[PDB]
Design a binder for this molecule. Structure first.
Ligand SMILES: [Cl-]
Lengths: 260, 260
C-alpha cells in the first residue's frame, strides 16, 4: 500500500461519483441524524458564498424540507448564518442564499468579538499576525454557530471535505469545529458536480488557496482519485498530509501513536 | 464485557496507580512531544486555580524545565494564562501560580470578546441563556490560548481526564479544545494523589459539579476503578456517557457508526 492509497482509504474518496446518488446519500444521512436525536430540530451553517458552504447548505436545507414534510413537524428548520467581520464576497454570499433559499437567515457580525479578543491579546503584549487573526475569526464563527445551535436545538454543519482534509486547510476548532460533515468523502471537482446537478449558477462554483498551498485543486483532486501527478505536487500534498495529522485526530493522549 | 468495563478500557483508567510513576510518565510524554516537533518550543495553559489545571500546569512546567536543561535551549518555556471574565476564583489562581512558578504569566481578559459576541447574537434576536454564555466563555478561552500558542510557537495543554471525559463535562471545542492531554487516564482522586506527591498545598485539591451531574466524584472514581456503585449513580453515569459520545469522536461523517 502506497501513501496515496492509504490517504484515499482514510478519506473515503471514490474515483468518480454519480452526482444524484451522492446528493441522495447525503440528504438521507442528514435526515437520519436528525431523526435519531429527539431534541434536535435544526441545522445551523455559516453561508460565506464559497463552493463548500453553498453545497452543504443546499443539502442540509433539502434534508430539513423533506423531513419536515414526512413528519409534519414545523419545528424542523435550516438556519443560514451570515458571519461578516465588519463590512465584508458579499455578492457571493447573496447568490448562495438565493440558491439555497433558507428557512431562516441570521446575521452575526463577529467584529466586536474578534476585536475584543485581539485587543485583550495586544494589551498583554501578544503580537497577532494576519494569519493568527484569521484563525481567531474562524473560531469566533464557530462560537457563533454553536451559540445559535445551543439556543435553537440545532446541530452545526461543517464543510470539511477530502480536498481540504488532505491538506489540513482549515482552522482546528474553527471551521474544523462542527457536529456533522455532509461533504466528507468528496473532492473539490466532485463538489462542483453536485452543485451543477442541483442547478447552481456557475458563478457559485467557478485561487488564493492554491498559491497558499503550492499545489492546485486539480492536482489534489487527481491525487485523491488515484491518478499520477507530478513529483513536486505529490511531495507538496504529502507534506501537508503529515503536517495536518493532529487536525485529523482527537487531542493527543499518552496512548496515541500517530504523532510519533 | 459490561459497559463499565468498556468505559474503563476506552478511558485507560487503572484501578490503582503509583503516583510518582504517573508524574514521570506524563512529564516524559510531554517532553517527547516537544522534542518531536522542531518548531514547537512552548506549552500554553489557562491557570484557573482548579485541581486539573494546577496539576497539568505543574507537569507541563516540569517537562519544559527538564527539556530546557537537557538541550540548553532557552526558547523552551511554559506560559501560564490567566483568563478572567471582567473582575473574577482569584485567590485559588494565585496559589496555583505560586505552586507552579511558571516561566511566564499572561492575563487576557475575555470580557470584551464575550460581550461583543453576546451583543452581536442578541442583535440578531437570538436569546442567550446563562448556560449558553458559559459555553461561549469556555470557547473564548480556547481562542485566547490558541492565539498565544500561534504567536509563541506553542501547543495548548488540555485538562481533560477520565472523570470528566466519562460524563462529557467539558465544552466541545471549548475546554475540550486542546493539543495534548497530560491527565488523560487519571480519575479525580488519582489527580489529587499526583498533586500531593508534587507537594501541593491541600487547598489546591480541596461541590457544584456533583450537583450539576447528579452523581459524586467518589462514585465516578469508584466506577472507573471497576468498583460497584448504586444503581442510581450507575444509570446517571451511563446517561452522561451515552449523551457525551459526540464529544469523544471526531465530527460525524457518513461512514461513522457510533451515533446510530
Ligand atoms: Cl464511529
Amino acid at each position: 500500500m502506497t501513501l496515496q492509497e492509504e490517504i484515499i482509504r482514510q478519506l473515503g474518496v471514490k474515483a468518480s461519483i454519480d452526482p444524484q446518488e451522492e446528493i441522495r446519500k447525503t440528504v438521507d444521512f442528514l435526515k437520519a441524524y436528525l431523526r435519531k436525536h429527539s431534541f434536535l430540530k435544526t441545522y445551523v451553517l455559516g453561508i460565506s458564498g464559497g463552493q463548500d458552504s453553498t453545497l452543504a447548505g443546499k443539502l442540509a436545507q433539502m434534508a430539513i424540507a423533506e423531513l419536515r414534510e414526512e413528519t409534519s413537524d414545523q419545528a424542523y428548520q435550516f438556519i443560514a448564518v451570515r458571519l461578516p467581520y465588519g463590512v465584508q464576497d458579499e455578492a457571493d454570499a447573496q447568490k448562495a442564499l438565493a440558491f439555497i433559499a433558507p428557512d431562516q437567515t441570521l446575521t452575526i457580525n463577529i467584529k466586536a468579538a474578534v476585536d475584543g479578543q485581539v485587543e485583550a491579546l495586544q494589551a498583554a503584549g501578544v503580537e497577532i499576525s494576519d494569519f493568527n487573526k484569521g484563525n481567531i475569526k474562524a473560531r469566533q464563527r464557530m462560537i457563533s454557530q454553536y451559540a445559535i445551535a445551543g439556543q435553537m436545538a440545532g446541530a452545526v454543519i461543517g464543510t470539511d471535505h477530502a480536498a481540504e482534509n488532505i491538506t489540513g486547510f482549515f482552522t482546528k476548532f474553527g471551521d474544523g469545529g462542527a457536529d456533522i460533515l455532509p461533504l466528507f468523502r468528496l473532492n473539490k471537482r466532485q463538489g462542483k458536480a453536485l452543485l451543477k446537478v442541483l442547478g447552481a449558477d456557475a458563478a457559485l462554483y467557478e485561487l488564493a488557496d492554491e498559491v497558499a498551498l503550492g499545489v492546485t485543486y486539480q492536482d489534489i483532486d487527481d491525487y485523491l482519485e488515484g491518478k499520477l501527478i507530478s513529483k513536486v505536487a505529490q511531495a507538496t500534498i504529502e507534506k501537508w498530509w503529515h503536517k495536518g495529522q493532529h487536525k485529523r485526530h482527537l487531542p493527543i493522549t499518552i496512548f496515541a501513536d500517530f504523532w510519533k
